[PDB]
Amino acid sequence: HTVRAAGAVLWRDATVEVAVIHRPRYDDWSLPKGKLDQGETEPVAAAREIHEETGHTAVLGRRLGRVTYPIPQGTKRVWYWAAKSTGGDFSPNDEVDKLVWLPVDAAMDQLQYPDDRKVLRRFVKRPVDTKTVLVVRHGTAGRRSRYKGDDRKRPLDKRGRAQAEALVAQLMAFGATTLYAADRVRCHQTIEPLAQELDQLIHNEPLLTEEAYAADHKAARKRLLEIAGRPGNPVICTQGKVIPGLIEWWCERAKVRPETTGNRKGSTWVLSLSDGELVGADYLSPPDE
Numbered sequence: 001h002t003v004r005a006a007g008a009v010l011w012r013d014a015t016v017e018v019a020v021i022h023r024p025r026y027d028d029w030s031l032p033k034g035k036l037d038q039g040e041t042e043p044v045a046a047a048r049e050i051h052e053e054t055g056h057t058a059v060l061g062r063r064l065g066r067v068t069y070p071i072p073q074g075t076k077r078v079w080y081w082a083a084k085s086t087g088g089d090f091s092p093n094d095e096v097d098k099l100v101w102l103p104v105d106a107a108m109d110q111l112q113y114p115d116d117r118k119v120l121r122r123f124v125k126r127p128v129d130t131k132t133v134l135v136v137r138h139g140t141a142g143r144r145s146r147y148k149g150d151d152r153k154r155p156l157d158k159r160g161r162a163q164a165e166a167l168v169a170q171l172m173a174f175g176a177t178t179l180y181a182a183d184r185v186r187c188h189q190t191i192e193p194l195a196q197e198l199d200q201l202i203h204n205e206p207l208l209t210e211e212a213y214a215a216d217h218k219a220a221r222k223r224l225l226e227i228a229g230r231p232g233n234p235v236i237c238t239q240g241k242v243i244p245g246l247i248e249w250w251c252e253r254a255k256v257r258p259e260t261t262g263n264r265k266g267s268t269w270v271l272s273l274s275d276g277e278l279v280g281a282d283y284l285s286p287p288d289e
């Protein structure tokens with residue numbers, strides 16, 4: 001088996017301080033992480049584990065890489081995020097008995113595992129006070145038909161409806177506040193469960209269908225940057241042919257390396273921006289993968 005886990009560098013203002021935890025099971029100093037519970041995706045598991053271990057709520061930002069090691073059960077795979085504390089404070093729990101807030105240099109010395117230190121080096125390499133654009137490929141929606149129009153009305157299938165419900169907690173982990181969808185039923189439907197959770201309208205985006213993208217790709221780019229520039233953390237749901245065109249373009253101009261790549265239905269690209277520049281592009285699997 002591969003056990004799936006998630007962790008973070010939890011940080012707050014003043015340079016910046018990060019949280020290092022102490023665990024009595026091993027008498028060690030490390031970054032918060034834990035295992036995914038049933039039906040959870042990594043971002044959710046990170047936020048939960050940060051709250052359980054540290055007492056802090058937080059909003060995830062840039063992904064900071066992956067750590068993999070053997071365990072009795074097989075292999076543990078831990079994905080890490082940068083996480084801005086949004087409040088709270090620590091008190092001892094069974095897993096974690098002490099927590100210290102340390103500037104990065106002092107954290108680096110406090111952390112006993114080389115793999116943690118590597119994560120913290122990734123954290124400091126780029127800005128961490130970022131805003132976030134969440135580009136989502138619509139969920140599964142059955143078969144393309146022979147009628148012209150790119151099936152404007154074709155709905156999510158059962159699996160896709162489930163993928164949409166699963167996205168809510170995942171997108172909320174990144175502080176999603178505003179909703180945008182290409183002018184296709186299946187794109188809207190994929191973020192309607194989030195819309196219900198936030199109680200918010202979805203802005204329709206005819207410039208971001210595959211049709212419009214091909215006819216005027218420059219209009220789509222311009223619109224994406226417009227959406228990105230507004231306050232808040234926008235969710236933009238679009239189609240398969242649009243996404244790589246836009247992401248690959250934006251990564252190449254910003255000199256951003258995506259550590260993973262894909263484009264499955266119900267996947268999310270977490271785009272981190274600092275000062276309006278892209279500093280990260282993180283591909284997340286569909287929640288039922």
Ligand SMILES: [Mg+2]
Pocket residue numbers: 032033034035049053095
């Ligand atoms: Mg833990």
Ligand SMILES: [Mg+2]
Pocket residue numbers: 033034035049052053095
């Ligand atoms: Mg834990």
Ligand SMILES: [Mg+2]
Pocket residue numbers: 034035049
């Ligand atoms: Mg746990």
